[PDB]
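Practice problem. Given the sequence and the SMILES for calcium ion, write out the predicted structure.
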Amino acid sequence: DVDSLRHSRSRLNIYKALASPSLIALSSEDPFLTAFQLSWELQELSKVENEFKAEYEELSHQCKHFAKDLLDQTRSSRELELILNFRDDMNLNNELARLKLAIKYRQKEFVAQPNCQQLLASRWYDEFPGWRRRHWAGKLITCVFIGLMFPLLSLCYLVAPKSRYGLFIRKPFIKFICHTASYLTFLFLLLLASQHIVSNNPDRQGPKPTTVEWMILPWVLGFIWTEIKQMWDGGFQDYIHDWWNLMDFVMNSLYLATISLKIVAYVKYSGCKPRDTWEMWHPTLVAEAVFAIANIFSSLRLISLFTANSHLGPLQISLGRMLLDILKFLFIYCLVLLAFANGLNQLYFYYENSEGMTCKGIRCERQNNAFSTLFETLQSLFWSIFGLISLYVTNVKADHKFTEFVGATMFGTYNVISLVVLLNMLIAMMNNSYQHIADHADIEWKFARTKLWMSYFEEGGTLPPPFNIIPSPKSICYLITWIKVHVFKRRSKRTETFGTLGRRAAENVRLNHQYQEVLRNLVKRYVAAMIRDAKTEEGLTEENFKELKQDISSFRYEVIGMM
Amino acid sequence: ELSTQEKSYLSAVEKGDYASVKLALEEAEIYFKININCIDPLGRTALLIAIENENLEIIELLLSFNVYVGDALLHAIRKEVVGAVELLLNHFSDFTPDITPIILAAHTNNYEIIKMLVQKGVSVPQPHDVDSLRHSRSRLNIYKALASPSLIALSSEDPFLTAFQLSWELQELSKVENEFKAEYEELSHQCKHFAKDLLDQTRSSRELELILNFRNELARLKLAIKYRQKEFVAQPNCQQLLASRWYDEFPGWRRRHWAGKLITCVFIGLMFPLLSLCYLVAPKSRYGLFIRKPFIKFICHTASYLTFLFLLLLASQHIVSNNPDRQGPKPTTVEWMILPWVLGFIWTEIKQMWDGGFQDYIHDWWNLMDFVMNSLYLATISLKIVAYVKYSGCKPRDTWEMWHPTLVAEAVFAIANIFSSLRLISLFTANSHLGPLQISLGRMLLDILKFLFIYCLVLLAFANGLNQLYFYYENSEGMTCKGIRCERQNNAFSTLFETLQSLFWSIFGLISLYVTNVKADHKFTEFVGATMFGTYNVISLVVLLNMLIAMMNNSYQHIADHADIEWKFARTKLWMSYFEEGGTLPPPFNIIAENVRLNHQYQEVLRNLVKRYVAAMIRDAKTEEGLTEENFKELKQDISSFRYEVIGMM
Amino acid sequence: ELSTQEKSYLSAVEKGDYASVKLALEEAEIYFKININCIDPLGRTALLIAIENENLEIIELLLSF
Ligand SMILES: CCCCCC(=O)OC[C@H](COP(=O)(O)O)OC(=O)CCCCC
Ligand SMILES: CCCCCC(=O)OC[C@H](COP(=O)(O)O)OC(=O)CCCCC
Ligand SMILES: CCCCCC(=O)OC[C@H](COP(=O)(O)O)OC(=O)CCCCC
Ligand SMILES: [Ca+2]
Ligand SMILES: [Ca+2]
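Answer key:
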């Protein structure tokens, strides 16, 4: 293509052609899948073009509305379950395959449909009807009961999930309650890991794990194993796509580093040393610091559960969807900080001033040598945005009053830029950002809530992390066979394991015909509700006036002619 | 499924040729080579098209020729073509199976159609499965049908109560569906304006008095306050009645200027004792019936509050306080005079809780502070009398033991001082300038508790962290006052409760640095400790507060267009608490054919009142709505059916 | 509050049919079986319909009878 606008216009015209609802009804033997792949195409191509991004995003949103409006035309729960439960067999049920596909395409306005959400809600509370008698304390007591009850409620499923109570945790909401209860017990053990009622002697290099640490360790392994399990099904494709997933990955890496540093301390520490005499950069200290940071991340990570609660849900979503703006603006803030740090170091480079300043640094009792090196200047310029820095850091141990004046002026310019210019700009930016992320704060929240629900729908990691590492009843029959993949036992899986006739197509064919009939009815209803609600419901333009005028005029002329 | 012989016939209907269509029907019977009830390629029965173009001339022909009617009624009803309905009445589907002509006619809100069906005897199945969305749809299709203004005007003898009980149902049934919530506020807030729009038809103060004073005085308004009908009381001419009743004794109070309003209020404010004692002893004719006037009682009531606090201002002065060092001191003189108000407020509180049964008492976010306001006074009195027995030694306060009954008593009284001084804010609901501001300042208070939930939890996240690092450095041996509130900020991150403290005070920049230092050279431990501290301010101080500003700012906008109607509901709910002659005494002086004729007189008001609404609703919506293509396509068919007739006869 | 001999009369005013309406007002005098100034069920006077359709041709007729 030597020219470019002809080709670009041709491509946009093509997409805008087969993105029309009317054409999808005629062609497109599978309108849902068509709209889905088409929205994906245009969303991923609105960045490749990047000059027509408005048009392509508009078209993708239009076909998303088409998918939602086509799902809307269902008239019976039977008609809905087939739509949500459908997928290509290819000889490979009812586990909401179409809905998971819709999640996979970021079709967030298709899963916010009312009756679809009703189906999911019904399938979430299967253990017990109602959940509408609940109130401020009615729901709390039944959830607190299970949150206390999860140990043996989990053990029952572990050993005897036949008929008594193993199916009671398999149910999704109970699984959620048990998981969040396990997380809360983890956090309780973490808070209690700092009390002196259990802590080991501080004056002991590389001590053996304390009993609380012994209890904590199975949670560490459980979280590591569940994150490896989650990785082994998304293949670092959606794994990185979830920012919560990145946060918990770094948390588990910090836990791994903590275990390694603790044990490598234990192999050679010999103990019996006061903490005030420990050499800097000792494995126990760094292990403790990493453990603390991991505690911070762990206690933060429960924010994700607030997507389930119908009150912190949208608020947490809006929190998430203006974090990008704060990152963009914080990059500029960091650039300005580096600039002023450069200058301030240039100025107070020579006044080293460490003859009597005991414990030199910004973080002293006197804030001395704040600008005497690049690191301390970076750090001092950070703290000044909070006011925790004082003046007289700009003073020097001499009568060089002009140097002090220009340094104070540079520091004041930095403060005016940050706390009066930049921070106010940040506020005025997120004000309009929130003003433009409230129109779809509900639909997007419901999409996130569905994403959280479907994680607990499947019969996968049904076991909370404390009772997850516990080996399966076999435990030596699945790991080995999956380990027999680099040898001849990889091919001994599709010859002797399967020897039957594979009698499934006759069910598959009837299922597909039933789904096709449902699609045919939905499409006919959508057409009959798009002609009668959009064609005859728009405005009256000048052209229609002209047509009516000319109809009258032709009438007059012909009746004149006939006499 | 297409052909060619009827595509002219199907278009002969659409053009509107009476002659050609009549011939095609005639040839249909003899030579069955054409389907009378054909289907358009887009899908429209020959009758279904004549319905759309409102042609009664050819609807007659199709109806007279045994055409398949099908759901043509349901389609005519949706298109609100009145002329076609009489023809159809007197003789796979698009709509949901549960929809019936009366249910769908109420959806369109068309009086002419609705009145015509109800005479035929149609009935609306009143509200109360294995399948979910045939119930939730049908239930919403019922409620939206019987929440329609036009249907309520025909059935539902008492339109006001019907718009009241119903609006309660939808409001309390949105929270149970929780997913059709938007589709239900669309209905509850639709019938909340029906009440206001029917009450506006009143054309005299007489016809207004009957509405409110029906099942004495202001019978119905006491009820609409219960149903949170806040768009019904804010009606202006109704609010005019209240103000003319809230300034009852003395006329005017419009001529008085800025300073004129003030002299005559403070002057009553300084006569509150004598204006209450006169009612206390003899409310015969002189002044005991002056307090009974709603305004004056408010001023006396408000005056008492001010005076009450005034002692709280006095109770802390050294001139009236007792000796500093007195184990369980005897009550001081001002405290003794304080005591009547404490009992005064409790007595009216128990009276308030008696008429609400804790279900209406708990609803106000005021009585939740009023309760703790009083309940901390029992903890004030009980502690002092406990300190008055088995504790009297006149011992210097330095050596007093912690948790001593007086110290608990003094603090718990101090806290109750705040919960009382802040409680006069509710008296600002009356001031027209601080009224809308205060009510709109509390309508987004919830959107701050919802957000100090996160900051209460992020604060736990780092307190979990910084403790886990520093807790091996206690150092609470050398530096006296091993706490945070000291001159030299000792070991702020030492215990869990000290780090909950240390982090909280950091949001105000009150926690200096070097609290992150340690009494050693572990410059890594300090640094990571300082980093955790620093990144806490970034998340909270500059990112969480900023998203709190950016969130109330939006939340304010949704509560601004109704920041006035809400306020007059808060004011009326404050006025009406003084209208009734109940607790009509300030706290310190507090402890010391009968209805058949009325009914048939009130029924004649509603019958005119509703008739005054319908005749003033069609002139405002049925002849004032926008213009759409479906009307334009009618005029073409209106002329084509006329040119094909004038030419056809020549 | 309905009838039959007026519903065509009221429609004739609504349809603008000046031809039929003059007959009813001319046939009313001989046989008082039709209410000239009646009210339709929705509530609109016969003459008020002509006021509503801005049709001067029958307004002059109505006021004339
Ligand atoms: C944008 C950079 C402004 C200069 C900042 C500065 O440090 O100069 C302050 C000067 C002198 O104060 P210092 O130099 O800070 O000691 O005083 C003013 O001019 C106040 C003007 C107040 C202006 C808000
Ligand atoms: C935000 C929760 C922080 C809890 C930290 C803490 O335990 O200290 C209590 C803090 C300050 O009291 P100190 O313990 O002395 O720090 O008071 C409040 O939180 C008032 C909030 C009332 C808000 C209306
Ligand atoms: C927004 C200013 C960023 C500039 C970075 C900088 O000055 O150095 C980082 C400093 C490191 O030095 P400390 O103040 O000791 O933590 O603080 C942070 O880590 C906060 C970043 C955490 C932000 C989430
Ligand atoms: Ca994860
Ligand atoms: Ca009270």
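Check your answer against the key. Chain B touches chain A through 85 residues (CB under 8 Å).
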